[PDB]
Design a protein around this ligand. Structure first.
Ligand SMILES: [Mn+2]
Ligand SMILES: [Mn+2]
Ligand SMILES: [Mn+2]
Lengths: 157, 158
DNA sequence: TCAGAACGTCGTAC
DNA sequence: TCAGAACGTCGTAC
DNA sequence: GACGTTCTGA
DNA sequence: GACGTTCTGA
């Protein structure tokens, strides 16, 4: 479709401006390795224009829409399966966050093998590099925290 | 052609998200009617990605790029001639600010006749309606201020 | 007299 | 054990 | 925008 | 994001 491509180009613009493509290290207490590398695309817009997020969901065919308790609404695609598809669709039109996407795509390749501490460690190191591209200030959970935990768990990386 | 349409669709997204399509009432002390109705599209981005605003300028073929003194940069197209061409390219793809664009396009029609006080008043009333679509809290120059000034100046309007 | 170029900063929607 | 769905809020880039 | 956290269930 | 103001020149 030249029509679907018109949609994605518009969405890339929106994402480039009011979106977030991210990899984070999230604490998971019942993981044997204690950490997940979570990947996501998020789109933010005031709840006053909530509908646009649903329109984005319709365009992509996946993802969730929620309302935050502060007047904001969010669209999120989280997880390797749905996200890889989403990013491949936007990849040709992204101008500001293409690096974030290329990196996340590198992480998604490793995700099915994150039970191996070495692979997890690589995913985590890649997450850190995505953090360096975002506006974020509160990034506390880092690759070093994974490496110190893994070592404490008796693993070798 | 289609490549251009992809560029415009993307720009519309970027405008829908981090842009501003607006109409304002600006005081002009040396105007006969004391006021102008200024129409504009603006794109905002941190100076860290200053390059993208230059990219937009290249895409549209007009408009200015400046750096503000707070780490922000802006791309701006101000004025009827450049703006109308600009809005018409984005208009099919705008999804959040199409109303602002359509209203500004109504205002652009009137601008070559804003020497007439009643036409200025129409554009000023229309600008007021664009201000209702924006997120601004700071707008203090409204249609009512033009109406009172024009009356003071000896003109007849309503 | 016009009016864009360029500017400086508040409030909140990212 | 996994990990998305849904959530709550800080700092600033709109 | 971009984090960290809690809920839910495969 | 979206204002109101100052510089510049047609
Ligand atoms: Mn932005
Ligand atoms: Mn926005
Ligand atoms: Mn924004």
């Amino acid at each position: 479709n030249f029509h679907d491509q018109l949609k994605f180009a518009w969405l890339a613009g929106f994402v480039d401006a009011d979106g977030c493509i991210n990899a984070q290290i999230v604490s998971r207490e019942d993981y044997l390795l204690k950490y997940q590398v979570r990947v996501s695309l998020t789109v933010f817009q005031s709840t006053t224009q909530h509908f646009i997020l649903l329109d984005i969901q319709k365009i992509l065919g996946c993802g969730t829409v929620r309302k935050r308790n502060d007047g904001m609404s969010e669209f999120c695609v989280v997880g390797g399966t749905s996200l890889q598809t989403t990013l491949e669709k936007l990849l040709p039109y992204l101008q500001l966050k293409r690096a974030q996407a290329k990196l996340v795509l590198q992480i998604i390749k490793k995700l099915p093998n994150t039970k191996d501490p070495s692979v997890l460690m690589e995913a985590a190191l890649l997450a850190d590099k995505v953090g360096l591209l975002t506006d974020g200030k509160k990034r506390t959970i880092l690759a070093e925290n994974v490496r110190e935990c893994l070592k404490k768990l008796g693993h070798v990386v």
